[PDB]
Write a protein that binds this ligand. Sequence first.
Ligand SMILES: CC(/C=C/C=C(C)/C=C/[C@@]12O[C@]1(C)C[C@@H](O)CC2(C)C)=C\C=C\C=C(C)\C=C\C=C(C)\C=C\[C@@]12O[C@]1(C)C[C@@H](O)CC2(C)C
Ligand code: FES
Lengths: 93, 206, 128, 341
Amino acid sequence: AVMVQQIEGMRDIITEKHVWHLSDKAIKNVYMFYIMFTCWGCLYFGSAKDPFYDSEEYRGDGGDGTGYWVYETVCISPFLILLGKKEKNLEMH
Amino acid sequence: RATWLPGLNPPPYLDGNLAGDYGFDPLGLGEDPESLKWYVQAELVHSRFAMLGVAGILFTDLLRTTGIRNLPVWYEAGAVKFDFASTKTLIVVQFLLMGFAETKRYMDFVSPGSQAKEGSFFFGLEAALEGLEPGYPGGPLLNPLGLAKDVQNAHDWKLKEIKNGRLAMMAMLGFFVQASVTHTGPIDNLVEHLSNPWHKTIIQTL
Amino acid sequence: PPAVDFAFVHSVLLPDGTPDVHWRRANGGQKLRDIMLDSNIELYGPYSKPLSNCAGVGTCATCMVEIVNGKELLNPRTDIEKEKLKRKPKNWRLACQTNVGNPDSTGLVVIQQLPEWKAHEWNIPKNI
Amino acid sequence: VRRCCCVISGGVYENLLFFPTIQLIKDRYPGVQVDILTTERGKQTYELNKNVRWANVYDPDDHWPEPAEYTDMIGLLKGRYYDMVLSTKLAGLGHAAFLFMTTARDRVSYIYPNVNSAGAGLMLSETFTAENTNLSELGYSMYTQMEDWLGRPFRSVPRTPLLPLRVSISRKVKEVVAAKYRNAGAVTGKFIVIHGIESDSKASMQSKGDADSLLSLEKWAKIIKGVRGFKPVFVIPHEKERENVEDFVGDDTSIVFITTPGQLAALINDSAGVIATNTAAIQLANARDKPCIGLFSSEEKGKLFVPYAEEKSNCVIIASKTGKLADIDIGTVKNAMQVFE
Ligand SMILES: CC(/C=C/C=C(C)/C=C/[C@@]12O[C@]1(C)C[C@@H](O)CC2(C)C)=C\C=C\C=C(C)\C=C\C=C(C)\C=C\[C@@]12O[C@]1(C)C[C@@H](O)CC2(C)C
Ligand code: FES
């Protein structure tokens, strides 16, 4: 592993060169354990007290889990107050 | 405002509300007002034809000099014999069609309501020729996009038009003279200037 | 001769508890910064060190002076007093960006120098 | 019909005046889910309508919209399956094709006196040529063509007004505006709203056709000095006007920040007096019977934007003797003393 390098410029070099590679099997092994960690984490952290998607801040206002519950909320609750306003005018407010 | 040379007041017969005025009339041509109107329409048509000309020359010569298409030089471009048609037919067809165009433009200039009222049949299209303005006809036929629906409050658009068109006319005079004493294309003269600018100009032609 | 009546009330109080007014003299209007430099009154305060100012151009808010009853003979703000000082009590101007006007001028403008590091509010009369 | 769009344009004021047209529509056919495809600050008026269903935001006067947005809104109007368009956008082909791509039974628009309106008749069942090309400049009514065709005598009466501009507020906007002027020193029955302040703000709710519609501040200082204080609350269009008004007319003068026309009508409904210039607030004051005065810059413009001053018998109109919004500031104080008590 010892190589003495002769370069005229600065100094001599004592390069080691430990050529190595994670065994072919060990790459499958680290994939195996990481799929195990993914499995464990999916199960356990799905079984966790998820503090944002439980409260009346999210599930109360809208909160179906989509990305449009805000927009259908602010597009339907004004129609809800227009409906309530018409039903108010139906009894002469 | 800034009228084409400081130290000179603009003429009182033209100022402000006109497409790119800048007060350049030292030879008293727009002194009479109807003469100025006729000259405005003349300028707009001249500038638009000249803009189409500069595009059709610069684009063709970009294709030619670089070598994308084997198009002819602007100078020697009229004598191209087309297979399907002849120039002797094309002059007559141009006469007919551009007569129907320019005489309609004229009869609108002298009578704006014309070409759209009664017995002005153009394939039933007697509505796209409403005109709306002198020199700015509008309508679905002439501005399909309608970038400037309004035209009085479109001073930016008309100013861009007239400035680009004055510059295109000057560039067309450039194409006329530059390629009658040098006998090359504009792009050739440009790259002749952009190699040694201090050794290839007009006066470096001996 | 046309003599504008600057007052130039100093920022700190006297230890007795009354302000000390200096009543400077200089002729007309060229720059308020040049008047306060020439007639020996304290403009910059701690910025009176040599490289602690922009020497009159306005690129630093170091010559600021509260001016009261100064709507009579004064130039408007040159978009540098409007920009260097922004969220102020609006009676504060830069001496190297204000000017009290023309040489033919009489008036009783009173200027509180150094509006930074002061303790009095002047109880300004509400305009309009 | 059962489903009807509205592709109205302009902003607060033009879309406000369209409320008798919407009430006419729901009076014409019994159950109609009316929609609105308006510009921004047009949606904000449609708390005050109790009739309609969606009221989107589109800015129809954009004339080079986002093609994703343009295609999305064409497909949205196709997926809502309308029967009648009722544009009043005042455009022809290009926009008539926009109304034509909607699967609509009754394509209705307004059409230029100029040329950009040709080839539109092909794609519209009603033409409705308009005037001035500045459609808000026509005044209050603005839709007499559309009012007279919607509900022609075919079975019964047109019924073209139904006590025009019956806007209506809800309890939620009433409570939040009640808190907003209760932060000021106003009592829920006894105050006077203004909504006229010289500003550079799009919450001014003016018009498209009026230019010098908003009164100044030192002129307003003269007006507010000449008038006795019935707690005049001041309605600024933007927060930079607050310190400016407190500099001009005083610190004791109460300032209520309102940019929403629904909040503005809620502030009308608790007031007892209105000193509005030609904004939305005159029409909101005429709604729910509040005594207005209605300042203007012209007697003729005041007749175009109020043709019904003789009808309500409270909106005693005042305008400028010249143009340019410089009136007497004296007799308007006199009939402000007359009608507000
Ligand atoms: C229309 C025009 C050019 C049009 C060109 C076209 C169609 C070209 C077409 C082609 O090239 C192509 C595309 C392809 C090729 O294969 C074929 C052809 C056919 C060859 C030029 C106008 C060019 C017009 C010019 C140069 C006009 C200049 C006017 C000036 C300078 C006026 C000055 C004054 O009048 C004022 C302003 C005020 C007065 O008071 C004082 C004075 C001083 C009198
Ligand atoms: S000295 Fe720089 S601010 Fe006046």
